[PDB]
Amino acid sequence: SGFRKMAFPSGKVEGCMVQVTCGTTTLNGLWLDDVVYCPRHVICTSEDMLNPNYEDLLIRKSNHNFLVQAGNVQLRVIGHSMQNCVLKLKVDTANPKTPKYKFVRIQPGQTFSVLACYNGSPSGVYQCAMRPNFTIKGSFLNGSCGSVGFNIDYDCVSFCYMHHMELPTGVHAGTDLEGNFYGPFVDRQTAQAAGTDTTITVNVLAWLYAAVINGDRWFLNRFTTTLNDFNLVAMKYNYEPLTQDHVDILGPLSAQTGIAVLDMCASLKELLQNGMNGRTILGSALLEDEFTPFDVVRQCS
Amino acid sequence: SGFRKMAFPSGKVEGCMVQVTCGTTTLNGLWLDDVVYCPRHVICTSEDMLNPNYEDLLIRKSNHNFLVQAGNVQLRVIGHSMQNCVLKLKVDTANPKTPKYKFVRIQPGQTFSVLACYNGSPSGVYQCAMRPNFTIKGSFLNGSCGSVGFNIDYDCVSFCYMHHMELPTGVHAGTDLEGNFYGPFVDRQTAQAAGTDTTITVNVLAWLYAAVINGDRWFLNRFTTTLNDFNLVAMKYNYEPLTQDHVDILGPLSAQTGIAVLDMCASLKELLQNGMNGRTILGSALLEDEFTPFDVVRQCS
Ligand SMILES: *[C@](O)(C(N)=O)[C@H](CC1CCC1)NC(=O)[C@@H]1[C@@H]2[C@H](CN1C(=O)[C@@H](NC(=O)NC(C)(C)C)C(C)(C)C)C2(C)C
Numbered sequence: 001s002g003f004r005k006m007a008f009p010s011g012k013v014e015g016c017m018v019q020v021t022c023g024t025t026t027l028n029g030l031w032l033d034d035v036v037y038c039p040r041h042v043i044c045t046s047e048d049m050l051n052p053n054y055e056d057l058l059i060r061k062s063n064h065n066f067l068v069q070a071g072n073v074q075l076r077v078i079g080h081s082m083q084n085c086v087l088k089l090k091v092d093t094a095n096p097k098t099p100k101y102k103f104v105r106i107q108p109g110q111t112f113s114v115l116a117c118y119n120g121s122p123s124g125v126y127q128c129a130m131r132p133n134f135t136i137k138g139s140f141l142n143g144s145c146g147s148v149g150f151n152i153d154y155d156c157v158s159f160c161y162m163h164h165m166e167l168p169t170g171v172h173a174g175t176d177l178e179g180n181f182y183g184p185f186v187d188r189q190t191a192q193a194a195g196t197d198t199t200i201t202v203n204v205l206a207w208l209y210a211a212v213i214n215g216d217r218w219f220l221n222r223f224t225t226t227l228n229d230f231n232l233v234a235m236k237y238n239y240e241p242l243t244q245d246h247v248d249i250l251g252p253l254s255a256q257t258g259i260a261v262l263d264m265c266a267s268l269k270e271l272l273q274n275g276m277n278g279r280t281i282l283g284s285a286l287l288e289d290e291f292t293p294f295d296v297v298r299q300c301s
Numbered sequence: 302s303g304f305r306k307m308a309f310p311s312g313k314v315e316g317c318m319v320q321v322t323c324g325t326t327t328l329n330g331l332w333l334d335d336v337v338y339c340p341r342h343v344i345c346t347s348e349d350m351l352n353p354n355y356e357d358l359l360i361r362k363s364n365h366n367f368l369v370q371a372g373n374v375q376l377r378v379i380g381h382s383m384q385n386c387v388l389k390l391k392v393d394t395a396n397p398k399t400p401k402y403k404f405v406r407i408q409p410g411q412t413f414s415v416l417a418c419y420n421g422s423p424s425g426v427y428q429c430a431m432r433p434n435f436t437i438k439g440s441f442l443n444g445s446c447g448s449v450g451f452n453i454d455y456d457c458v459s460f461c462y463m464h465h466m467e468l469p470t471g472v473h474a475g476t477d478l479e480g481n482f483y484g485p486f487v488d489r490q491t492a493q494a495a496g497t498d499t500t501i502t503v504n505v506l507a508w509l510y511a512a513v514i515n516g517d518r519w520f521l522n523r524f525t526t527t528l529n530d531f532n533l534v535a536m537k538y539n540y541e542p543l544t545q546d547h548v549d550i551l552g553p554l555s556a557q558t559g560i561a562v563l564d565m566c567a568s569l570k571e572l573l574q575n576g577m578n579g580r581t582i583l584g585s586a587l588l589e590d591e592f593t594p595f596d597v598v599r600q601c602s
C-alpha cells in the first residue's frame with residue numbers, strides 16, 4: 001500500500017553509459033554491443049547549432065576525433081555514421097554488460113524511466129510520461145544530453161528515448177534510439193513551438209483507481225455518465241477523449257475495485273467542473289495524468 | 302533545467318538483494334559480504350506476530366529453516382544471530398557484487414532512495430524522506446519487507462533503512478541496518494501510534510529555491526522577517542523551527558539565486574497565511590518538504 005512515482009531499476013542501463021567527447025562538447029552515449037549511440041550535435045560548436053549542416057559538419061570529422069570513455073577505459077572508434085539525429089560510433093570492443101534490449105518508439109501517454117547522466121556517469125533516475133504534444137517534463141542540466149529513457153520487460157531493456165534539447169518551462173524533447181525526434185522538433189537552435197498539450201484522460205482515471213485502492217474515496221459520487229456525455233466535458237477541459245479501448249485497458253483496475261469505468265468518469269466529471277475544493281488525492285492537490293494503467297497495477301499488485 | 306523527485310542509481314544495490322523464506326513468510330534480504338540481513342519477524346507465523354518472544358522463537362529455528370535464494374542459486378545458511386530487530390544469516394558464499402558500503406542512521410528530514418523489492422527481485426526505485434515523526438511515505442506491498450533505503454556518497458553506498466511494517470494512510474516504519482527502529486515502533490502486530498508529523502521547514506525553503514532557479518518566482522515578495530519572527534508563524538502551521546544552522550545550510554542556494562534566506566522565509570510566511578491561490582510551484586499545488594538542500598543542489602548544479 002502507498003502509491004509513489006516509481007522508476008525501473010537502473011542497473012542494466014548503468015553499465016551501458018559512456019562518455020563521448022568531440023572537440024568542445026562532452027555528452028553521454030549508449031554503449032550497446034559494439035556501437036555507441038549519442039546525439040549528433042556533439043560534433044557542433046556553439047556557432048554551428050544556430051544553423052547546422054550535419055552532413056558537411058560530420059565530413060570534417062574522422063574516427064580519431066571522437067573520444068569515447070567507459071569510466072576510465074578508452075574505447076577506440078573504428079567507424080562513424082549518422083542515422084537521422086543520432087550518431088553511431090563503431091568501437092573495437094563489444095560491451096560485455098550489454099543486456100537483452102530492443103529499440104521501441106513509445107506512443108503518447110505512455111511512461112518510461114530516465115537515467116539522467118553527466119559526463120558518462122549516471123546521476124539519478126525518475127519517471128516521465130510522453131506528453132500528447134510529444135514532450136517530456138524531465139530534469140536535465142548542461143551535460144545530460146545522451147541520457148536515455150527505457151522500460152524493462154523481465155530482462156529486456158526497451159530503450160525509447162534519448163535526450164537532445166530543452167524547451168521553455170522545464171520542457172524537454174528528444175529522439176528514439178533510431179534518431180527520429182518525437183514531435184515536430186529539429187536539432188537546431190532556432191524558434192520552435194510545442195503543440196497544445198492535453199491531459200491524458202485514461203491516466204487520470206487509472207490514478208483515481210489507485211486512490212480508491214489505497215482507501216482514498218471521497219471523490220466518488222452517485223452519478224454516472226455516457227461516453228459521449230463525458231467526452232463533452234473532457235474536451236472542454238482539454239482532456240483526451242475516452243474510447244472503448246481505454247475502458248478495456250482499465251478492466252483490471254475496475255475489476256479489483258468493483259467500480260465501473262463510467263462511474264469513475266462521472267466522479268472525474270464533477271472534479272473538473274467543481275474542482276477539488278482544497279482537498280488532496282493520494283497526497284496531490286492536482287489531478288495526476290503521468291501514471292498509466294500498467295503503472296498502477298504494478299504498484300497495486 | 303527542470304526539477305523532479307530523483308533517486309540514486311540502484312545498480313550497486315540490485316546485486317545485493319536476495320530472497321529469504323522461513324516457512325510461510327517470504328521477504329527480502331540484503332546480501333553483504335557473507336551476511337544476509339533481513340527483518341527478524343520472518344521467523345514468525347501470523348499468530349506469532351501478535352505477541353512474539355523473538356528469543357524463544359529464534360531458538361526453535363534451525364539453519365535449514367531459512368531458504369535464501371539469490372536468483373536461481375540457493376545460499377547455504379551456516380549460522381544465524383539476532384541484532385535488535387534484524388536477523389543476520391551468515392552464508393557459505395561471499396557476495397561477489399558487494400560494493401563499498403557503510404551503515405548509517407539518518408536524521409529526520411533527510412532523504413534516501415528506496416529500492417522496492419519483491420521475492421528478492423528489485424521492482425522499482427523512488428525517493429523518500431525520514432519524516433519528523435520517524436516514518437516514511439513509501440510504496441510497499443506484501444512481500445516488500447527487507448527492501449532497503451540508501452544514499453550514494455562515492456563509489457560508497459550508505460545503507461540507512463530497512464522496511465518492516467505498514468501504518469495507516471500509506472505510512473511505513475522500519476529500522477536501520479543495525480536493527481534499531483526509527484521512532485517508537487516495535488515489531489509486534491498490536492496497536493501503535495505515530496507521533497504528530499511536522500513539516501520540514503528547511504526542505505520547503507530549499508524547494509522554493511529550486512523553483513526560483515527554474516524561473517518560478519511569483520511567490521517572492523519584498524518583505525523580510527527575523528528568524529525569531531518567522532518561527533512564530535511556522536509554529537502556528539506545524540512547521541519545524543528554523544535555526545541558524547539551517548540558514549547556513551541554505552547558503553549555496555541563497556548565493557546562486559541572490560535571495561537571502563530570511564527573504565525567502567518572508568515569502569514562505571505569506572504562502573502559509575494567504576495560501577497559494579490555486580497556483581502551482583514547480584508543478585505542485587502544495588508546498589513540498591521532501592527535498593533537502595543537497596537534493597536541490599544536485600539537480601541545479
Ligand atoms: C546537450 O547537448 C548537453 N550538452 O547536455 C544540450 C543540453 C542544453 C541544456 C543547456 C544545454 N542540448 C543543446 O544544447 C541543444 C543543442 C543546441 C540547442 N540546444 C538547446 O537545448 C537549446 N534549446 C532551444 O534552442 N530550444 C528552442 C529550439 C528554441 C525551443 C538551449 C537554448 C537550451 C541551449 C541544440 C542543437 C538543440
Ligand SMILES: *[C@](O)(C(N)=O)[C@H](CC1CCC1)NC(=O)[C@@H]1[C@@H]2[C@H](CN1C(=O)[C@@H](NC(=O)NC(C)(C)C)C(C)(C)C)C2(C)C
Pocket residue numbers: 327328340342350441442443444445446447465466467468469487488489490491492493494
Ligand atoms: C512484511 O514482512 C512483508 N511480508 O512484506 C510485512 C509487510 C506488510 C504489509 C502487508 C504485510 N510486514 C508485517 O507484516 C509486519 C510484521 C507483523 C505486523 N506487520 C504489519 O505490517 C502490520 N501493521 C501493523 O500492525 N500496524 C500497527 C502496529 C497496528 C500500527 C499489518 C497490519 C500491515 C500486517 C509485524 C511484526 C509489524
